[PDB]
Amino acid sequence: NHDPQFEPIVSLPEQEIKTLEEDEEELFKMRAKLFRFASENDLPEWKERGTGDVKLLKHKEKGAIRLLMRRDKTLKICANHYITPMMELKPNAGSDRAWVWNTHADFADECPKPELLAIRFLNAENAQKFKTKFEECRKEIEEREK
Amino acid sequence: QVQFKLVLVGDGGTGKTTFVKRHLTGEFEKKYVATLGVEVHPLVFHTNRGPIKFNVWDTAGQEKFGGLRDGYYIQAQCAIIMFDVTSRVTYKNVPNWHRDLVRVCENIPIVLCGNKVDIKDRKVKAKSIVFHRKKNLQYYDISAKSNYNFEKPFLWLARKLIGDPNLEFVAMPALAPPEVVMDPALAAQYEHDLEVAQTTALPDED
Amino acid sequence: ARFSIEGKSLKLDAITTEDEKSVFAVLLEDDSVKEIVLSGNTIGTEAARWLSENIASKKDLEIAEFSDIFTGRVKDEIPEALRLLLQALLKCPKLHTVRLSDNAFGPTAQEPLIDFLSKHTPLEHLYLHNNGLGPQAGAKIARALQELAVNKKAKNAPPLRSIICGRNRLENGSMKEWAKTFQSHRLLHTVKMVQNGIRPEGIEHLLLEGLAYCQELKVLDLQDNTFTHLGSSALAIALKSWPNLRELGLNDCLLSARGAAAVVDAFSKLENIGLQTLRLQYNEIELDAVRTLKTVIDEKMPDLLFLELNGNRFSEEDDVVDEIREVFSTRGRGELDELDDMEE
Ligand SMILES: Nc1nc2c(ncn2[C@@H]2O[C@H](COP(=O)(O)OP(=O)(O)NP(=O)(O)O)[C@@H](O)[C@H]2O)c(=O)[nH]1
Numbered sequence A: 001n002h003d004p005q006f007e008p009i010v011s012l013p014e015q016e017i018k019t020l021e022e023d024e025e026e027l028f029k030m031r032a033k034l035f036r037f038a039s040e041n042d043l044p045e046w047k048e049r050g051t052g053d054v055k056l057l058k059h060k061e062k063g064a065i066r067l068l069m070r071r072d073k074t075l076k077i078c079a080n081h082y083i084t085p086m087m088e089l090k091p092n093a094g095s096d097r098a099w100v101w102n103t104h105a106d107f108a109d110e111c112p113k114p115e116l117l118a119i120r121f122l123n124a125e126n127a128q129k130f131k132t133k134f135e136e137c138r139k140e141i142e143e144r145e146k
Numbered sequence B: 001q002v003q004f005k006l007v008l009v010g011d012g013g014t015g016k017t018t019f020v021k022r023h024l025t026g027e028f029e030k031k032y033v034a035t036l037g038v039e040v041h042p043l044v045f046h047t048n049r050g051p052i053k054f055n056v057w058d059t060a061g062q063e064k065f066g067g068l069r070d071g072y073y074i075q076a077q078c079a080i081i082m083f084d085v086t087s088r089v090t091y092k093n094v095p096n097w098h099r100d101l102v103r104v105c106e107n108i109p110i111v112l113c114g115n116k117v118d119i120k121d122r123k124v125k126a127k128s129i130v131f132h133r134k135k136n137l138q139y140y141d142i143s144a145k146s147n148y149n150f151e152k153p154f155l156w157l158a159r160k161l162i163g164d165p166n167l168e169f170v171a172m173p174a175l176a177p178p179e180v181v182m183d184p185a186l187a188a189q190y191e192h193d194l195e196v197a198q199t200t201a202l203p204d205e206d
Numbered sequence C: 001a002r003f004s005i006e007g008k009s010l011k012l013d014a015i016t017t018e019d020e021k022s023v024f025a026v027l028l029e030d031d032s033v034k035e036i037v038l039s040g041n042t043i044g045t046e047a048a049r050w051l052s053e054n055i056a057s058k059k060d061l062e063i064a065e066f067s068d069i070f071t072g073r074v075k076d077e078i079p080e081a082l083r084l085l086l087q088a089l090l091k092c093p094k095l096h097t098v099r100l101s102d103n104a105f106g107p108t109a110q111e112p113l114i115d116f117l118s119k120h121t122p123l124e125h126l127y128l129h130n131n132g133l134g135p136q137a138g139a140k141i142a143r144a145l146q147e148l149a150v151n152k153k154a155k156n157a158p159p160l161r162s163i164i165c166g167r168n169r170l171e172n173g174s175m176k177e178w179a180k181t182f183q184s185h186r187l188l189h190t191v192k193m194v195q196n197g198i199r200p201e202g203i204e205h206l207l208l209e210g211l212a213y214c215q216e217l218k219v220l221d222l223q224d225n226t227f228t229h230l231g232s233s234a235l236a237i238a239l240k241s242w243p244n245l246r247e248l249g250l251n252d253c254l255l256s257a258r259g260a261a262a263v264v265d266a267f268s269k270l271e272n273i274g275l276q277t278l279r280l281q282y283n284e285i286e287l288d289a290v291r292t293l294k295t296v297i298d299e300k301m302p303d304l305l306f307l308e309l310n311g312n313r314f315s316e317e318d319d320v321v322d323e324i325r326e327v328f329s330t331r332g333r334g335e336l337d338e339l340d341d342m343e344e
């Protein structure tokens, strides 16, 4: 109809949720599409994991830097892991706007899980802006410990 | 932590499962693999009034309407009836799904979804749709494949159940990821896969 | 010779108590049963096992109605139970008709099916409607049926006559294989592959490479797929291959205006048309084609008892509507449908 009317089933107070990204930083932010890779399928394939803004964040209280991405409209997290020393961005076959890497512990599902990601950008020039930024963040982190 | 039992219903091949899959993974399953009986899948969303969880009951579209499938409906609190915009038969069945439903649930928020609006040769045009007028339902064109309006159903339902016409989805606490140390016997064989990936091209859909 | 528990909505998990067993008392004392109907109940694995033992003893069984017997059953049970049941059916030499419709199958339960459909030579009428097969399992079922033709020939068995397989999303993906199945059974009388997501290239192949070889075809229903001009031209070329066609169902096929004109033109060239029911709803058919169809029906379709044109692109008020009604009135036999939903 124009607007069906119903009586609420519950009453919930207005609430203020934290992003848990306030002690943030935010070195990089940019629109992109993320891909998860196959699994125990034995049929190596790239499944979409989300489309949205990727962001690099370094902690102020510490030195830790991580990758964090959220899906459009729904705002669910689709990638959240630290950037370790032994982590790069090897290109993906053809293309010029796609990078692929590994992570021993993504926490998108708030459950520790190894992941073999891959992210694409609109222009190959953006892929570079992200790649360059990623490289240095990885560098700074390499220095960090000892 | 609030919870809502939502019944997902509709004819076979309409996209019920593909729809749920996208919401809890982000992937778009292109293989049709019929659902047997029912599969319960939990989906949570963060709103300005806190996190809410929908326990979605994805049901099978081959089972005849009847008392045999009352367990799925019993104590439901909302529902989604799906049909395929490229199949008139699929649409003609909506009235049967919406009836079997109200027979045991009575008055509960229900949204009708016309899936596959991405396909070119459309049969059931948005104009034609009127059923929602007679049955006090909300309607939405959607496409699990392109994501068109893919989040509307859950949002509308939340507003009716919670009672806030202006409730909206927000952020999502971004907890800290695990340590990540190791390297010994763990290293090496990693790069083996990393290659098997930097080689396999990506589905150019953009 | 008839056992039935139709529509009893029984939740059959085990069949062990003195009661329960009583339910199947007739099935036990009468080995002469010719028909068994289990529809409208939910059979668990254990109960399936008990029924298999008792069904294989029915050596004179001719019909098995196993449609709608697994509602509420999960992927944990259906495949097992189905295997037990179809295992017993293979042991019935006179079983010419089997119905397995309205059961959630899909690939996850294709095993028993593929097994059965390829070795049951007595089969004559197959009902595998609304089962959620899919293009993968659908292609496999199609191949299994090709096998059946070979095993039938090796035992001088009766031809397969009916295949009712719709609402399974066979899609374009399994049409190369289905075309081959129809090549294997050229004495089919009834075939309905309604609402399977089949598209133009699909319909084109299916027609010219499949159904076109079934010269004895009597009933054909492809409702709710997508023909457009491609499928339409295929249909136009194929009609001359079904001399005894009696029912042609093309509702919801988006034949398109140009396509419909081509089909109507085809009927125009046929001779001795014994067509009895013609379904052409929602096809974007335009007034011009409807005009010629009217006159083709007047001069060449003397047995037409039902026509269906609702949902097309012409006015319910146009002249032809009355002219058509006039034809049926003058004959004292004929019938047009309610044109209460014309397009545009
Ligand atoms: N092009 C397109 N195809 C879609 C869309 N969403 C789903 N599909 C396709 O629809 C098919 C079946 O979807 P699925 O979710 O398995 O159907 P179901 O509703 O769960 N059927 P069932 O009751 O038998 O379990 C798959 O091939 C899937 O890729 C869409 O928006 N567009």
Ligand SMILES: [Mg+2]
Binding pocket: B016, B017, B018, B033, B034, B035, B058, B059, B060
């Ligand atoms: Mg499903």
